[PDB]
Amino acid sequence: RVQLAHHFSEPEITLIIFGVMAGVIGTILLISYGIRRL
Amino acid sequence: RVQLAHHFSEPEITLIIFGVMAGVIGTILLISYGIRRL
């Protein structure tokens, strides 16, 4: 798993973060709801 | 430059899905650990 070519790439950085951010937060909310049962 | 050499591209959707997928699953695992308290 070694990289090559000294330079920046994958400009979709923000996208990756946003996705994980939305998913993580989403699961938390849903999960928190299960514990309550209501 | 033609054929082979991993034809470049410009994805997006996949990235968004992967991110949310990793984040969601990640939170679940961590959360599940808290409920166990061990």
Swiss-Prot record, chains A, B:
Describe what happens upon changing Q3K.
In ENAV/MARS antigen
Query: Where, subcellularly, is it found?
Result: Cell membrane
Q: Which domain of life is it from?
A: Eukaryota
Transmembrane spans: 13-35
The family assignment reads:
Belongs to the glycophorin A family.
Its function? Answer: Component of the ankyrin-1 complex, a multiprotein complex involved in the stability and shape of the erythrocyte membrane. Glycophorin A is the major intrinsic membrane protein of the erythrocyte. The N-terminal glycosylated segment, which lies outside the erythrocyte membrane, has MN blood group receptors. Appears to be important for the function of SLC4A1 and is required for high activity of SLC4A1. May be involved in translocation of SLC4A1 to the plasma membrane. (Microbial infection) Appears to be a receptor for Hepatitis A virus (HAV).
The remark listed among the other comments is: Involved in several unequal homologous recombinations or gene conversion events, predominantly with GYPB and more rarely with GYPE. The resulting fusion proteins are observed in different phenotypes and encode low incidence bloodgroup antigens.
Query: What protein does this entry describe?
Result: Glycophorin-A
What lineage does the source organism belong to? Eukaryota, Metazoa, Chordata, Craniata, Vertebrata
Parent protein range shown? 80 to 117 of 150
